[PDB]
């Protein structure tokens, strides 16, 4: 199809509402929980949306857990996003990351090993790799091991990556080249290759067609939800938005639009219509 993905958790706009609030919009389909910012030693950060912890200090988030389940009843997909700009994360090798697949499965997925579960009995629909530290070690091996474990589950799981538009990406390039990935939420902002810059969708399309181990990987046009969601690359021209979408929706590789982040895209108005709503509507046509 064509979906809207939104990051949620880091409260970019200040006025961030509950996960479920955004799920109860018609406006977004995929929700990326931002972030598991610390690993292999587990650490979550959802700005103001979760502050309770287990005794060991790992976040414990009952409201998000309830909201994951509400979101899923409404047909939405909820992935846990790893990493972030800033944060505290690194794999020393493939074996370490393979161990970590099991940790994720037992902590967030349908794994049976009795670890502390930040989301109680709520189960994510998969993981986003928003690696922004320019270290690529382990992610490919982690994704591949996760896939083997997913077969033990009772639903489809998704893996995504959040590269910036320069190709190849210095953090998730290896992941994208050597693992089976469902969605690429490519950040077309803070970079020369934005829509208004030297837009390089064509390179990503070559990647999807010839390089991606998953040939029906879906590429997403990743955008700021407001001017001031990022330093640069935000698009307020609905004609440019229209022509862009028309250019890129031609192929089976086009998945939709990704936005940083829900707080921003839902509160940013273009004459009283939320930005996320404008974009959802541009996609449907």
Ligand X SMILES: Cn1c(=O)c2[nH]c(Cl)nc2n(C)c1=O
* Residues at the contact surface with ligand X, assessed by CB under 6 A: 84-85, 130, 162, 187, 230, 260
Nearer to ligand X, 5 or 123 (CB): 5
Told to judge if 132 belongs to the known catalytic residues of this protein, a careful annotator would answer yes
- Least distance to ligand X, CB of residue 221, Å: 12
Give the residue from 62, 74, 79, 61 showing the smallest Cα distance to 22: 74
Which residue of the set 17, 69, 132, 152 is catalytic? 132
Helical H segments across the chain, by residue range: 19-23, 62-73, 94-108, 139-150, 173-178, 201-206, 238-248, 262-267, 275-284
DSSP-derived 3-state class of residue 178 = helix
Q: In whole angstroms, give the CA distance from residue 19 to residue 25.
A: 11
Q: On the CB side of 96, how many CA atoms lie within 13 Å of its CA?
A: 11
Give the residue nearest to ligand X (CB). Answer: 85
Q: Can you read off the two tokens belonging to residue 260?
A: 């940083």
Distance of CA 56 to CAs 59, 61, 140, Å? Answer: 9, 14, 30
- Least distance to ligand X, CB of residue 100, Å: 20
Q: In whole angstroms, give the CA distance from residue 48 to residue 12.
A: 11
- C-alpha dihedral, 235 to 237 to 238 to 239, nearest 10°: -120
Give the residue from 71, 73, 74, 67 showing the smallest Cα distance to 46: 67
Nearer to ligand X, 91 or 185 (CB): 185
Nearer to ligand X, 223 or 248 (CB): 223
Nearer to ligand X, 34 or 72 (CB): 34
Nearer to ligand X, 105 or 189 (CB): 189
- Catalytic residue numbers? 132
């Amino acid at each position: 199809n064509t979906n809207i993905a939104v990051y949620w958790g880091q409260n970019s706009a200040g006025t961030q509402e509950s996960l479920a609030t955004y799920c109860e919009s018609s406006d977004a389909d995929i929700f990326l929980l931002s972030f598991l910012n610390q690993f292999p030693t587990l650490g979550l950060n959802f700005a103001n949306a979760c502050s309770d912890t287990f005794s060991d200090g790992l976040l414990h988030c009952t409201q998000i857990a309830e909201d994951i389940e509400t979101c899923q009843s409404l047909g939405k997909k909820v992935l846990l996003s790893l990493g972030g700009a800033s944060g505290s994360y690194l794999f020393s090798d493939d074996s370490q990351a393979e161990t970590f697949a099991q940790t994720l499965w037992d902590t967030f997925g349908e794994g049976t090993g009795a670890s502390e579960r930040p989301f109680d009995s709520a189960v994510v629909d998969g993981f986003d790799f928003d690696i922004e530290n320019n270290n690529e070690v382990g992610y490919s091996a982690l994704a591949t091991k996760l896939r083997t474990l997913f077969a033990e589950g009772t639903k489809q799981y998704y893996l995504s990556a959040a590269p910036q538009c320069p190709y190849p990406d210095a953090s998730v390039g290896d992941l994208l080249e050597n693992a089976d990935i469902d969605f690429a939420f490519i950040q077309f902002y803070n970079n020369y290759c934005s829509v208004s810059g030297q837009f390089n969708w064509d390179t990503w399309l070559t990647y999807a067609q010839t390089v991606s181990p998953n040939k029906n990987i879906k590429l997403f046009l990743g955008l700021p939800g407001s001017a001031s969601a990022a330093g640069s690359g935000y698009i307020s021209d609905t004609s440019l938005l229209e022509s862009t979408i028309a250019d890129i929706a031609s192929s089976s590789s086009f998945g939709g639009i990704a936005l940083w982040d829900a707080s921003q895209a839902f509160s940013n108005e273009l004459n009283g219509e939320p930005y996320v709503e404008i974009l959802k509507n541009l996609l449907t046509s």
